Ligand binder design. Structure first.
Ligand SMILES: Nc1nc2c(ncn2[C@@H]2O[C@H](COP(=O)(O)OP(=O)(O)CP(=O)(O)O)[C@@H](O)[C@H]2O)c(=O)[nH]1
Ligand SMILES: Nc1nc2c(ncn2[C@@H]2O[C@H](COP(=O)(O)OP(=O)(O)CP(=O)(O)O)[C@@H](O)[C@H]2O)c(=O)[nH]1
Ligand SMILES: [Mg+2]
Ligand SMILES: [Mg+2]
Lengths: 428, 428
């Protein structure tokens, strides 16, 4: 008396809650005959309402047993048909939040038939069984690892599938535009007035500024996703390490904007901070060195940071000097002393303000595939203006559509799937 | 159509799962009209099966809303009458395991009527409403924070209430022994043969070796609970910091035995490690200094650790020398080099093996109250041998019983309750 559920994978197990101490922790398992396996270690307190023959979304209070030995007191939640995260049947034992206990709970599952889950495997299965699309599966991981109000908020928008509905809108627009020329190529004498060429050139143009708008989102969305890549550059003993350490590879947040610190990825960095040992630099007229870097990366925002302000006497004349002979803005700093750092950050968070309500695109795969989508759309657009064969024009619209589908996983790669889900923590 | 449930406290909220990133996290709330409050932020997906009118141990899939804004997609578990951790009605929203998300979920509960839970408040309420006794409430916290197989296993035994049944056994034995003399003090002429004095002296003696056995458990159980307090002592520049750091206040585990490292708590320390700069010590015949410390703490195990074995040439003759002129065992070590540390630990874990199946007592409150219990039992025991008034004898048995009850919370203190539950993490 059952339906057409997706064939479930081998039973897997992992700890779903963070590592550390806490009141509670979750170990979750999913796959084929998972609750039958759970039944063999879980003892319901009262009678013996078998876990396997239980309804979906029902909690059960009891104990996990390793034969004679008690493991913990747990609540066991039963997920049923397609109605669960992985769309296969799963059970999540929520238990006492101790490393030793939770670890011992995991091994009980492993020793009893579960293979340990692989990075992202849970979320992957969600995508693979069609409960989630590749965008939403990306959004889940992004929401967990998010470090900003904006980062979190964007993940929510995407996990809802705001981008996804926006794309399915273009998907069906391309399908409509695609099938117009594919009717011109059935032909044989089929000229039914109501022109094909004019009606389509616009259909492509509507779809192009549609896609181009989304391409511009990345400009901003990248900063939302992974912050502002900032490089601290200087000299031997300018105080780079001491600045990096007091500010917190690893990174900090300030005024709801994330900053990615690092130490070669100089080119392609949004903000360059040049640190010099104020006065104490043995050869000081190396503000040519700081002028050259500013001239070497015009794409970046630049700030000169005069460090060790506490060792230096009259600093106002030295700051003004450096500012003059480089044509940059200079901020006075003491890195070990932590002096005026809050001035530095208030300045740091200023070109990171870039030139409204609308859907964003995070990290470049979506971006890159949207570019190719645009190119093909514009190849097709130009191809009409040059009066070329329908075969070639319809063949670009196919390419465009294939790229758009690429981002929602419509066209699977299973190597793209890996570079995505390898970043995922073991347990979804 | 309801029962006699304990009056529930003000609605509280806290994050129940560890801090960090993970697939899932739990925010839990408990108190008066908690699910009514939950109903005001949680939207069930399908129709509108109100959370308040739902059955116990039933999960509900939906979304948390902050008015118009979505907060997360959650499963909401409903706990009902006395059937929950705190015995009051509670709900645990299990949601996406991101710091930003989980944090935003907590504030939604707080902004909607919940006061933030206090350290241990959840487990305290468990005890206060009588679902758990003070021993079991102690065991819960101990199981979470445990760092050893033994530590964890002992917590399980106690959370079951193994000690608790063992005590309730003495509780009713004292009640029986207490009421025997209290019948002698009703008297007026009541000498009903079947002697009172002989039958009771043994009843006290049975109960005394009963209690004394448990007092001896602490000797061992303390080491199980908080490991072996080990002090690394030396000289200016003997390499104490470098040894401490490579070995890992904070502490390490080795061969299923926990070691508590530290740097005055010299007296009352199980293991003393004396570290000296092998050879390089400017005045070396300061092995008198190391002999004096061994003679100053005979209660401890002692090991001399000859550090910086890598700088020193012929070390075997220097080690043998130090070993001779101090009467201690000497282990050769290089702290930065990490050389023969595994030999040191194999030696460290040797007097930490102390002179079988039976119930243990962890940290001294139980220990101390069991001492007083024994004293009073033995005061009463001696008092019979000295033929003193029944009033005085019955008054010691009362004192004994009161001490035994003290450990299971039978006699509340609410300042003892604080020093216990202040150690607890916010959220049980
Ligand atoms: N007075 C003062 N001294 C500083 C300050 N910052 C660093 N120093 C001194 O200068 C040294 C700089 O060390 P560090 O912070 O590692 O600078 P660095 O540029 O990373 C060294 P490298 O070029 O090798 O990476 C420190 O050892 C410290 O004594 C400061 O803000 N004020
Ligand atoms: N060759 C060698 N040198 C060491 C070793 N351990 C420490 N040193 C050297 O001796 C110094 C000892 O520093 P430290 O480890 O802090 O010893 P300490 O006894 O804690 C210093 P204090 O007495 O001030 O606490 C180090 O700076 C290091 O250069 C070792 O195992 N081998
Ligand atoms: Mg450095
Ligand atoms: Mg030191």
């Amino acid at each position: 008396s059952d339906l057409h559920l997706p064939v479930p994978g081998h039973p897997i197990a992992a700890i779903a809650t963070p590592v550390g101490v806490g009141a509670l922790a979750i170990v979750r398992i999913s796959g084929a005959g998972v609750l039958d396996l759970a039944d063999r270690v879980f003892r319901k307190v009262h009678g013996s309402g078998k876990l396997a023959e239980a309804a979906g979304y029902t909690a059960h209070f009891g104990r996990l047993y390793d034969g004679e030995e008690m493991v913990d007191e747990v609540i066991a939640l039963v997920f049923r048909a397609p109605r669960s995260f992985t769309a296969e049947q799963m059970v999540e034992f929520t238990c006492h939040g101790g490393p030793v206990v939770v670890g011992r709970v995991l091994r009980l599952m492993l020793d009893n038939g579960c293979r340990l889950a692989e990075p992202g495997e849970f979320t992957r299965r969600a995508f693979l069984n069609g409960r989630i699309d590749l965008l939403q599966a990306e959004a889940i991981g992004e929401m967990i690892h998010a470090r900003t109000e904006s980062a979190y908020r964007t993940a929510v928008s995407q996990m809802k599938g705001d981008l996804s509905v926006r794309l399915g809108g273009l998907r069906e627009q391309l399908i409509r535009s695609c099938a117009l020329i594919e009717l011109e190529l059935d032909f044989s004498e089929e000229d039914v007035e109501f022109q094909s060429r004019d009606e389509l050139t616009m259909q492509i143009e509507t779809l192009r500024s549609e896609v181009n708008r989304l391409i511009d989102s990345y400009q901003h969305g990248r900063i939302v996703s992974e912050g502002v890549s900032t490089v601290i550059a200087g000299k031997p003993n300018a105080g780079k390490s001491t600045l990096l350490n007091t500010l917190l590879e690893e990174c900090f947040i300030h005024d709801k904007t994330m900053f990615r610190l690092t130490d070669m990825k100089m080119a392609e960095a949004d903000l360059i901070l040049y640190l010099l040992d104020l006065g104490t630099e043995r050869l000081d007229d190396e503000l040519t060195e700081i002028r050259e870097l500013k001239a070497a990366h015009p794409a970046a925002k630049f700030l000169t940071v005069a460090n060790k302000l506490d060792r230096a006497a009259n600093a106002d004349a030295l700051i003004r000097a450096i500012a003059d002979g480089t044509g940059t803005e200079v901020i006075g700093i003491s890195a070990l002393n932590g002096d005026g750092i809050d001035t530095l950050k208030q300045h740091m968070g200023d070109l990171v303000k870039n030139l409204e309500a609308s859907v964003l695109v995070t990290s470049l795969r979506h971006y890159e595939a949207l570019r190719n989508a645009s190119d093909a759309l514009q190849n097709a657009l130009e191809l009409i203006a040059h009066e070329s064969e329908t075969e070639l024009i319809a063949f670009e619209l196919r390419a465009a559509l294939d790229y758009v589908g690429q981002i929602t996983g419509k066209v699977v790669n299973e190597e793209v799937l890996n570079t995505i889900f390898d970043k995922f923590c073991i347990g979804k």
